[PDB]
Amino acid sequence: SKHLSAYLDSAVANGPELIVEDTGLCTSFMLLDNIPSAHLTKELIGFTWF
């Protein structure tokens, strides 16, 4: 009955998922802070700015 039901009705969906939409940014590479910058508060004040 499974095969017969399968062969008789084609409205079983199972279609490939074609429509996929993105509203974000078309990029695949991320700029990454690997090593954080140090916070200076006693000496060398002003050399870095956040």
Partner: protein, 1273 residues
């Protein structure tokens, strides 16, 4: 099994016989029957002590909460009503009360009691209210207990006896032993627990005992009290226990039924509570089966032939099931569960649903499950006070949503008004339809034929009747002195009696009497309110003739009466099967109360006007049925009024409309209530018998047709629905009978209609019916309900609950019957268990036990002697019950389809032949001179030793006493006769015809010396038959009873050693069975639920032959030569005589005399006589000439082709040449084929080819003797 040890010795022997251990014998047959009649019934309950139950059932003490009866009854307007407890006005049934306080003690049995003589006296004499209320309550409560074919305890005893020992296996490879076992049945355990309350010293006092005059009750001690509902609960439990065993259901389902009954019994009004939640089981199971994903299986492929009017169907293979074909309608779980929540029985639904989910695919198991669960509904014949019934049913009037405005009518025509042409709508459609039919009836020389006139007058007389008192009063009122014939001992209320009084009178003198009271009656039902019987008087029945005639024409000439020809009821079987197939969508409809909704203000006025106008085309001066034309005033023109003549038909309408407008005036005289007769009118149509089906079916068809073709397309919204709704017509899409109707949709192309459109369609139909006040009560569940038959996916489902094993209707306070009648009850009881497919082996065992108890009985003179008798068991074999085990054979080799009568005997002997002959030779000395069929071995003495002859002749004896004549009463007999003949022979031509025919006949029969004393059917004897029927309807005097017992005993004791001449000759034939025939259908496909490999024999018989009656060339002999006949005479006697004459080669004038003897004119007599020929006659048509008929049990099988080309009467390579029939084969071969197929159907297992192998005498000798016997009779 210690229970087997508990049984007394004779019953132990009987149980062994039923189990197949030993061949049954008259000796043990009597010992068991005798001892049952002497021991107290309570011992049957005592047997229950020896069953170690292990079921999870608890009987709450809530049962013993008797509600006081005094508040459940009252009298107002001098009638005892029911005053329902709940606000629901329908709680009019027997309450739950303790009957105890109303009991005295009996002198015979001091323990049990009956009503106080003081109470009934005061209610009778003083008309005291409380006395009357108590009496009414006692009467109905007793009556409800009496609704059983016999005492339930006896049935319980039967069940224990058969279930006390497992049956011995046969040698058959399909003989599965029973899977179910005792100690697991919730019903029996429930009976045990509840009965524990009714013991004082281990005595088990029965709560009640049924008697011929009703039922008695046991006086409770001061501590206890007996509620009447308990007795009802026991009956339901016993009935369920029996049914569950026979249907072989799982204990879980039986558990649910027990809880079902217990919950109902706990609350007040046990009947009402059951009635409310009636349809729960079918809705849970039948209405919702395949609403899932894993659907599949095999289904029948049925095709409806092109001339659909003929209702011819063809089996044409099988269809694979798949998900696209699964049912579309919503399930029924939600409403049912919601209802069950009210009675806190949701567990039952959960259990049922969970169990149902185990059958996703359609097969034998699924339908078997459906059959079993649907068998759980209560099988009790509910009864209520007739006064409440009549007050509750006829108090309804239809509500019309758009009445015909008064300005829509013309001026009066004396009584009727014609309908203005400008008016449209369904009413216009109805008006035109009836008018057109009236026109066709108007000119029709079919009437005024004196023979046809005789048919109509004769149709009005039956043994029953009513309203005679009203008749005598009304005519005496108008100065008409009717005759009397009391000395002729016949009931006055019989329709025959009143008819005789009328015979002489000029008809028009009687016209004033039609406006007279009509008595009424009530017949109880199993699953609904009781039905009504409203017999009109003969005069009223005569006046309403035009209404019937037009209705008949509408039916027979539009949709061919939708099967209301009722020729064989089985034509609906293939119809519903086809209607339930996957490719088709079907909807079940039926008028809510067609009898109560047809009325004069809307319906009958339109019909009367149409008929009166429709009869205008015709001779204005033409009397009809003695009603002459008259002058009536026409007032259609306000400027030119006048008067003109109108034909008799119109005069009938004039009075008929007057009567309908006045409304029927009934008079109730219920006996169960006390001194409360009264009369009140109503618009409710009589609808007491099939004579009403014609009118309602006609109107049913008309409204449906207008809805389909006009109203629906103009009103529906879905374009797709419009597309499919069009191209649809009633003649090929709708059938009906009375209120019931079936609507089936055109095959949606490889698809199914949206449930959305269905809802739209069904909704509009409801509104359409609401317009003119018809509640259509439609439903859509992809099943077939028509005339109480159920089909699911082309498989028939026997609703066994509608045939309760223990229940039987009784409409009077007294059973009013004599002991021998019980036998016929047993026979009818057994057949239902065959029609419905039960476990054929176990059902047979139970049947014999029932027979054994019934086999014995007695009677006592009103003052004098007692009398007694009992039958040898072989009687029941002749009556149509297969034997379980013969000496020398193996048990359970005879199928239930074994034919009754001589055929069954012959088949049994034919199989039993060789063993008997050989055994007789060893045991007994040879007889003194050679025998035709036997050798010298003398088996007849052996048969007498088995008492076969005793049983064979005992079954032939009559079972109802005969009333005695008298000579002055014979002057009334002559007076009765004369008048009946006078009523029959209104004209003179018929009398001349019959007299000439009779005179010629006896002259020919004697002179030609065919024979003398031939009782040939003739009209002169029809009044004699009526008189005998009328006298028979009376309660016989005791002397007749004494004659019966004495005659029966003498017939038993008389030593005879011969069967009937026919059976003697039939034994000369030797028949053998070959291989199995080719199969009809795939064994996988189920066709009848329960006819499965488990229930092998039914499964074999159906599979081999196929169910669908498909006589493509046989027509089963329905083409009788005499289409038109008068009542009283038998067509089956007439054609038998005619064929017998034709075989005897009588001269043509013999046929002429016989035909003229039943009113046929000479010209048509010659025309009919010429048609008689051995060629065109059918196998059954010619075989019936020697009373070889088809058993009713076969009517559901396609036996035609088998009898045609599978029962070889002469196979060249097998038959001995001595058996060659030669030229007489033209009429010999059908007889042999009938004998062959009867033997083949007798044995169990698959159907095999049947072959005549030898006739001991030459076939010529057999034919010669047959011709002699044919000439003799």
């Amino acid at each position: 099994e210690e229970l087997f040890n508990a049984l007394p010795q004779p019953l132990q022997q009987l149980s062994l016989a039923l189990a197949g251990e030993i061949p049954l014998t008259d000796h043990i047959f009597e010992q068991a029957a005798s001892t049952w009649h002497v021991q107290p019934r309570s011992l049957t309950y005592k047997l229950l002590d020896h069953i170690p139950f292990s079921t999870p059932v608890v009987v709450p003490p809530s049962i013993y909460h008797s509600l006081d009866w005094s508040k459940c009854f009252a009298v107002n307007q001098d009638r005892v009503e029911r005053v329902p407890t709940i606000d629901d006005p329908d709680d009019v049934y027997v309450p739950n009360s303790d009957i105890g306080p109303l009991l005295t003690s009996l002198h015979t049995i001091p323990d049990y009691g009956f009503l106080h003589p003081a109470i009934e006296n005061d209610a009778t004499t003083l008309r005291a209210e409380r006395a009357r209320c108590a009496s009414t309550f006692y009467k109905i409560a007793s009556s409800q207990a009496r609704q059983v074919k016999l005492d339930p305890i006896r049935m319980l005893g039967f069940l224990l006896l058969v279930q006390a020992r497992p049956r011995v296996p046969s040698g058959l490879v399909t003989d599965q032993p029973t899977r179910r076992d005792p100690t697991q049945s919730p019903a029996l355990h429930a009976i045990w627990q509840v009965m524990q309350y009714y013991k004082v010293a281990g005595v088990y006092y029965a709560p009640a005992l049924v008697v011929p005059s009703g039922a008695i009750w046991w006086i409770p001690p001061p501590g206890k009290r007996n509620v009447v509902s308990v007795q009802y609960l026991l009956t339901d439990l016993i009935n369920l226990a029996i049914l569950a065993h026979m249907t072989d259901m799982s204990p879980t389902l039986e558990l649910t039924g027990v809880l079902m009954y217990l919950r109902a019994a706990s609350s007040h009004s046990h009947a009402y509570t059951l009635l409310q939640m009636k349809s729960v089981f079918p809705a849970l199971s039948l209405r919702s089966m395949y609403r899932n994903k894993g659907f599949g299986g095999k289904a029948p492929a049925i095709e409806w032939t092109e001339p659909r009017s003929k209702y011819k169907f063809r089996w044409t293979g099988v269809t694979q099931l798949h998900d696209g074909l699964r049912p579309r309608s919503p399930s029924m779980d939600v409403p049912t569960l919601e209802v069950l929540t009210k009675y806190e029985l949701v567990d039952i639904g959960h259990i049922i649903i969970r169990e149902r989910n185990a059958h996703p695919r359609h097969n034998h198991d699924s339908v078997r499950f459906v059959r079993d669960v649907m068998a759980l509904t209560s099988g009790m014949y509910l009864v209520r006070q007739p006064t409440m019934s009549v007050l509750r049913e006829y108090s309804q009037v239809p509500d019309i949503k758009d009445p015909i405005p008064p300005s829509a009518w013309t001026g009066p025509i004396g009584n009727v008004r014609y309908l203005l042409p400008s008016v449209q709508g369904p009413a216009r459609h109805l008006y035109d339809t009836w008018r057109a039919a009236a026109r066709q009836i108007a000119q029709d020389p079919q009437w005024h034929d004196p023979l046809n006139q005789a048919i109509m007058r004769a149709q009005y007389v039956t043994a029953r009747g009513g309203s005679s008192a009203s008749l005598k009063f009304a005519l005496k009122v108008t100065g008409i002195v009717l005759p009397e014939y009391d000395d002729s001992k016949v009931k006055k209320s019989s329709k025959i009696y009143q008819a005789a009084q009328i015979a002489r009178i000029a008809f028009m003198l009687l016209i004033a009497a039609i406006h007279a009271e009509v008595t009424m009656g009530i017949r109880n039902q199993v699953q609904r309110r009781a039905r009504s019987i409203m017999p009109l008087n003969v005069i009223q029945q005569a006046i309403s003739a035009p209404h019937t005639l037009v209705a008949n024409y509408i039916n027979k000439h539009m949709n061919l009466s939708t099967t209301s020809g009722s020729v064989v009821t089985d034509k609906v079987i293939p119809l519903i099967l086809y209607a339930s197939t996957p490719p088709n969508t079907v909807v079940n409809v039926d008028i809510k109360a067609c009898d109560a909704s047809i009325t004069y203000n809307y319906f009958l006025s339109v019909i009367c006007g149409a008929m009166h106008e429709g009869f205008e085309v015709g001779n204005a001066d033409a009397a009809f049925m003695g009603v002459p034309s008259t002058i009536v005033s026409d007032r259609r023109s306000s400027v030119a009024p006048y008067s003109r003549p109108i034909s008799g038909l119109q005069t009938m309408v004039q009075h008929l409309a007057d009567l309908y407008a006045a409304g029927f005036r009934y008079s109730v005289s219920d006996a169960f209530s006390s001194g409360n007769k009264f009369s009140f009118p109503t618009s409710t149509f009589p609808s007491g018998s099939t004579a009403t089906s014609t009118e309602h079916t006609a109107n049913n068809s008309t409204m449906m047709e207008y809805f389909l073709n006009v109203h629906a397309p103009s009103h529906v919204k879905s374009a797709s629905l419009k597309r499919i709704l069009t191209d649809m017509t009633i003649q090929r899409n709708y059938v009906c009978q009375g209120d019931d109707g079936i609507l089936l949709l055109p095959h949606e192309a490889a698809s199914k209609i949206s449930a959305d459109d269905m809802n739209e369609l069904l909704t509009c139909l409801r509104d359409y019916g609401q317009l003119f006040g018809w509640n259509y009560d439609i439903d859509w569940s992809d099943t077939a309900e028509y005339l109480k038959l159920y089909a699911l996916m082309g498989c028939r489902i026997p609703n066994t609950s509608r045939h309760p094993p223990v229940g039987k209707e009784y409409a009077a306070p007294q059973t009013d019957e004599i002991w021998p009648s019980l036998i016929d009850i047993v026979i009818g009881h057994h057949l239902n268990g065959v029609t419905d497919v039960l476990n054929w082996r176990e059902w047979l065992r139970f049947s014999w036990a029932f027979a054994c108890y019934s086999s014995r009985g007695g009677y006592t003179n009103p003052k004098g002697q007692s009398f007694s008798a009992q039958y040898p068991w072989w009687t029941f074999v002749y009556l149509g019950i297969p034997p379980i085990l013969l000496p020398g054979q193996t048990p359970f080799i005879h199928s239930c389809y074994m034919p009754p009568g001589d055929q069954g005997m012959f088949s049994i002997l034919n199989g039993w032949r060789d063993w008997l002959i050989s055994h007789a030779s060893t045991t007994l000395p040879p007889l003194r001179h050679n025998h035709p069929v036997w050798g010298l071995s003398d088996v007849p003495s052996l048969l007498s030793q088995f008492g076969v002859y005793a049983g064979y002749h005992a079954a032939q004896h009559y079972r109802r006493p005969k009333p005695a004549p008298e000579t002055a009463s014979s002057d009334s007999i002559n007076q009765i006769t004369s008048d009946l003949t006078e009523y029959l022979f209104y004209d003179s031509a018929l009398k001349a015809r019959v007299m000439k025919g009779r005179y010629n006949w006896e002259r020919l029969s004697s002179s030609l010396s065919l024979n003398v004393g031939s009782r040939v059917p003739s009209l002169f004897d029809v009044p004699g038959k009526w008189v005998a029927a009328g006298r028979d309807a009376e309660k016989p005097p005791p002397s007749s009873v004494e004659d019966m017992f004495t005659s029966l005993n003498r017939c038993i004791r008389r030593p005879t050693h011969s069967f009937s001449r026919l059976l003697e000759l039939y034994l000369r034939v030797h028949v053998t069975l070959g291989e199995s025939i080719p199969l009809a259908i795939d064994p996988d496909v189920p066709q009848v639920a329960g006819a499965d490999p488990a229930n092998d024999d039914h499964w074999f018989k159906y599979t081999c032959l196929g169910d669908i009656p498909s006589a493509t060339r046989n027509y089963f002999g329905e083409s009788l030569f005499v289409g038109r006949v008068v009542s009283g005479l038998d067509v089956e006697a007439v054609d038998a005589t005619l064929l017998r004459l034709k075989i005897l080669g009588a001269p043509p004038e013999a046929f002429i005399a016989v035909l003229n003897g039943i009113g046929m004119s000479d010209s048509e007599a010659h025309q009919i006589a010429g048609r008689i020929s051995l060629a065109n006659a059918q196998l059954v048509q010619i075989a019936r000439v020697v009373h070889l008929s088809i058993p009713s049990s076969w009517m559901t099988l396609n036996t035609g082709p088998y009898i045609h080309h599978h029962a070889y009467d002469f196979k060249p390579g097998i038959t001995q040449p001595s058996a060659k029939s030669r030229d007489k084969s033209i009429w010999m071969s059908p007889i042999l084929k009938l004998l062959c197929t009867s033997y083949a159907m007798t044995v169990a297992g698959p159907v095999r080819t049947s072959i005549v192998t030898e006739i001991d005498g030459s076939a010529a000798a057999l034919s010669g003797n047959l011709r002699v016997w044919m000439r003799d009779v």
